[PDB]
Amino acid sequence: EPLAAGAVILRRFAFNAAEQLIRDINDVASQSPFRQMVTPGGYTMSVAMTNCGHLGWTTHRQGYLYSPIDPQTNKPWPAMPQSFHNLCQRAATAAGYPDFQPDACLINRYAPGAKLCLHQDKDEPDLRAPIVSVSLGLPAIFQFGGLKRNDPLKRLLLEHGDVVVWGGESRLFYHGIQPLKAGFHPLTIDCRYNLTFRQAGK
DNA sequence: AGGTAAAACGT
DNA sequence: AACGGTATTACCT
Numbered sequence: 540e541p542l543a544a545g546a547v548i549l550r551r552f553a554f555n556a557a558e559q560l561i562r563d564i565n566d567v568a569s570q571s572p573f574r575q576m577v578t579p580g581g582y583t584m585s586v587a588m589t590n591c592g593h594l595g596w597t598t599h600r601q602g603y604l605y606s607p608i609d610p611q612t613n614k615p616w617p618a619m620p621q622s623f624h625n626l627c628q629r630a631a632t633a634a635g636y637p638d639f640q641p642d643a644c645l646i647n648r649y650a651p652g653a654k655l656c657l658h659q660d661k662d663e664p665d666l667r668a669p670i671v672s673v674s675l676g677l678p679a680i681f682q683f684g685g686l687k688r689n690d691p692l693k694r695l696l697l698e699h700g701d702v703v704v705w706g707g708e709s710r711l712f713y714h715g716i717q718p719l720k721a722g723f724h725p726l727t728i729d730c731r732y733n734l735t736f737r738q739a740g741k
Numbered sequence: 742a743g744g745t746a747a748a749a750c751g752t
Numbered sequence: 753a754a755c756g757g758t759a760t761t762a763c764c765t
């Protein structure tokens with residue numbers, strides 16, 4: 540059974556690339572550090588975030604926004620690493636989205652207890668483009684639902700190297716991550732990373 | 742008129 | 753602890 544219409548999980552797809560990906564996460568973060576963003580309502584997110592590529596996802600007083608500038612450094616987000624771009628292209632192709640051209644990569648870091656409550660990815664103007672989501676390090680339970688928040692959820696464990704792609708009919712589906720269980724991973728030690736690639740501009 | 746925050750407490 | 757209320761509103765543009 541496939542994940543959903545237009546959605547697939549490619550288990551361990553990024554396993555072989557993982558060590559290089561993690562080195563490049565560290566390189567990106569050395570320029571635009573991980574930070575826990577504050578919601579418009581004033582709550583600090585448990586996930587720590589940074590971005591690379593032309594556009595980075597951020598919170599603002601006024602809402603959510605894709606911006607070419609890191610508001611913490613006041614400099615452009617770091618360029619998207621070639622390792623990221625290549626892995627993304629290969630995964631998108633395997634998932635049936637060969638033409639995907641991301642201009643944005645959000646890097647999520649989960650410490651024990653960190654979560655991402657059910658939400659839609661909808662700040663992108665071109666919804667024809669899929670989301671490509673790469674898991675690294677400790678395992679997490681990914682929720683994948685429907686167009687409505689109360690639509691029944693699938694819960695899938697995402698392990699190191701797993702890639703999830705959604706788009707088309709499932710592009711706007713609600714999804715999230717349940718509070719991260721503590722553990723050990725030889726490459727990330729005590730955390731999970733996720734890379735989410737999007738076409739956020741035009 | 743439409744977009745939209747909640748990507749965030751009680752049972 | 754899985755499910756669902758809340759935005760059933762108050763602001764922007």
Ligand SMILES: O=C(O)CCC(=O)C(=O)O
Pocket residue numbers: 645647655660672681714715716733735
């Ligand atoms: O960490 C994940 O697997 C999901 C991340 C996510 O939903 C997002 O970046 O919008």
Ligand SMILES: [Mn+2]
Pocket residue numbers: 658659660714
């Ligand atoms: Mn998301």
